[PDB]
Amino acid sequence: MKPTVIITGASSGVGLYGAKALIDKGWHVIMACRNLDKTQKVADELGFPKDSYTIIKLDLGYLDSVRRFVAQFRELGRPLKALVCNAAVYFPLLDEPLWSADDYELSVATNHLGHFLLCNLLLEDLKACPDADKRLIILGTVTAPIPAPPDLGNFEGFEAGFKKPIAMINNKKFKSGKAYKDSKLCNMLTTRELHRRFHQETGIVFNSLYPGCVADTPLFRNHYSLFRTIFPWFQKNVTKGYVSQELAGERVAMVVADDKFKDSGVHWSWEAFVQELSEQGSDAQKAQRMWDLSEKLVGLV
Numbered sequence: 001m002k003p004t005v006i007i008t009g010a011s012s013g014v015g016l017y018g019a020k021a022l023i024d025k026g027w028h029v030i031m032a033c034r035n036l037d038k039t040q041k042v043a044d045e046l047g048f049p050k051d052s053y054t055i056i057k058l059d060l061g062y063l064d065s066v067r068r069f070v071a072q073f074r075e076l077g078r079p080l081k082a083l084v085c086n087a088a089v090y091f092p093l094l095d096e097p098l099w100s101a102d103d104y105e106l107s108v109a110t111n112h113l114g115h116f117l118l119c120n121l122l123l124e125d126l127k128a129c130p131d132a133d134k135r136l137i138i139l140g141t142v143t144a145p146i147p148a149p150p151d152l153g154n155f156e157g158f159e160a161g162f163k164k165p166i167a168m169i170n171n172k173k174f175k176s177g178k179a180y181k182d183s184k185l186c187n188m189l190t191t192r193e194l195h196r197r198f199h200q201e202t203g204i205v206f207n208s209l210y211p212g213c214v215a216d217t218p219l220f221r222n223h224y225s226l227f228r229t230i231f232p233w234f235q236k237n238v239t240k241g242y243v244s245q246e247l248a249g250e251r252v253a254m255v256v257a258d259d260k261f262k263d264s265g266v267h268w269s270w271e272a273f274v275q276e277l278s279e280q281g282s283d284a285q286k287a288q289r290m291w292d293l294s295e296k297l298v299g300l301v
């Protein structure tokens with residue numbers, strides 16, 4: 001009966017409060033999380049009604065776990081109306097790179113490659129769903145806390161198979177902050193390419209979303225702590241573009257469910273949401289390369 005949405009990384013921050021807001025709207029939320037105990041705990045602490053959500057294990061750092069999640073979701077027999085790619089990792093105090101179960105640098109492997117496989121797999125479920133209005137939302141960047149800009153180069157690391165000791169998409173020296181930025185740029189390019197390749201054929205809406213500066217989540221906590229040691233007058237709610245976790249989740253819920261956000265191939269940013277189209281140019285060319293190589297790394301070919 002209830003429309004069904006999958007949210008990755010729903011045990012914390014934006015994903016958790018997006019699930020809360022979507023449950024309030026009458027949806028059934030699949031909480032695709034790696035830590036089943038932590039997820040159940042925070043779902044109870046916020047009083048989620050048990051008939052409105054289901055917890056299924058997903059570890060985006062293990063490609064076979066991504067396939068196992070899809071198999072387990074299909075066992076439920078719920079038609080898939082929406083997918084929110086929300087989970088992300090950032091390691092602000094990392095000197096040397098960490099590796100995924102498939103020997104890919106952890107940030108890109110989790111934030112991008114895991115989601116990339118999940119989107120390509122779940123595209124068949126979104127197609128099979130009979131609803132006219134079906135949406136795939138990707139949490140992205142500000143425009144279409146870390147001052148270093150992302151730089152994919154010519155994907156030399158991807159072209160070489162991206163296996164360790166390769167640590168960056170352009171095969172340069174590992175930097176954990178730039179690694180996060182590079183992986184979030186890949187999310188944005190995935191949205192561009194999903195729209196270009198599949199919107200006309202399938203009718204599915206493919207958009208990215210910047211919910212605002214959600215300073216209270218754990219993601220950038222170390223940056224805020226470092227700010228306080230230098231500026232002791234500093235609090236998180238004074239950050240530029242600060243939004244609460246509850247409001248961020250409501251904005252996710254709007255982009256998933258509301259009629260105002262039916263256009264495909266745009267980036268929603270924040271107040272009543274500014275829209276940015278993803279047209280053509282230089283990043284459209286990068287997106288095509290990003291897609292082709294990512295298919296090889298995740299075993300789709």
Ligand SMILES: NC(=O)C1=CN([C@@H]2O[C@H](COP(=O)(O)OP(=O)(O)OC[C@H]3O[C@@H](n4cnc5c(N)ncnc54)[C@H](OP(=O)(O)O)[C@@H]3O)[C@@H](O)[C@H]2O)C=CC1
Pocket residue numbers: 008009010011012013014015032033034035038058059060061085086087088089110139140141184210211212213214215217218219220
């Ligand atoms: N916070 C901000 O200010 C901004 C955030 N964003 C985007 O919003 C999204 C959420 O960020 P935020 O909510 O702040 O970060 P949080 O750390 O608060 O939530 C991160 C979520 O990702 C999940 N996750 C991490 N690794 C994996 C994995 N390998 N497999 C499955 N789930 C995983 C975590 O699970 P666990 O609970 O087990 O850690 C957690 O639930 C991200 O995509 C981020 O890029 C964009 C702009 C600003």
